[PDB]
């Protein structure tokens, strides 16, 4: 008997950034720290998916801002 | 500037089970395979959270059943 488990895993990270960092840049920092490929990363803030070529300042992302990220992995 | 990213990660696993396995047992298999502590595991099927001392048969979980799991981790 084989069953399938759709595992949804929640982990909170902190990131050291400049307002001038692009979204692409942030996804690279998340890869460097957590191993999530950036093309599997969907960064979310204030009700939007964020576009790679914009900066954190473009989205008024200020310090202690709380973003979300949804990713798919094959293995942890 | 420190920001916080709430990362939600999705990964699908398959598990080799008997109808007679308890929920507790399944969470142990998921720990053994993925490293998620079983006390951080919330197994979900057909609209319910599953209770540790019940068996997969108790929930009519049949082969190719699709369960969900929600967990918190400190690190991947």
């Amino acid at each position: 008997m084989q069953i399938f488990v759709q595992t949804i895993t929640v982990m909170r990270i902190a990131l050291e950034v400049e307002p001038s960092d692009t979204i692409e840049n942030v996804k690279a920092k998340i890869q460097d720290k957590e191993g999530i490929p950036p093309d599997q990363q969907r960064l979310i803030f204030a009700g939007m998916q964020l576009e790679d070529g914009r900066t954190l300042s473009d989205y008024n992302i200020k310090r202690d801002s709380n973003l979300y990220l949804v990713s798919s992995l094959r293995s942890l | 500037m420190q920001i916080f990213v709430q990362t939600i990660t999705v990964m699908r696993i398959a598990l080799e089970v008997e109808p007679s396995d308890t929920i507790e047992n399944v969470k142990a298999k998921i720990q053994d395979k993925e490293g998620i502590p079983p006390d951080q595991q919330r197994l979900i099927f057909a609209g319910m959270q599953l209770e540790d001392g019940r068996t997969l048969s108790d929930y009519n979980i049949k082969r190719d059943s699709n369960l969900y799991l929600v967990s918190s981790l400190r690190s991947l």
Partner: peptide, 17 residues
């Protein structure tokens, strides 16, 4: 996992407000 990803994105968009 596209259909679960779209759902979770939609949920994370909600949570972000």
């Amino acid at each position: 996992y596209p259909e679960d990803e779209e759902e979770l994105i939609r949920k994370a968009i909600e949570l972000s407000l």
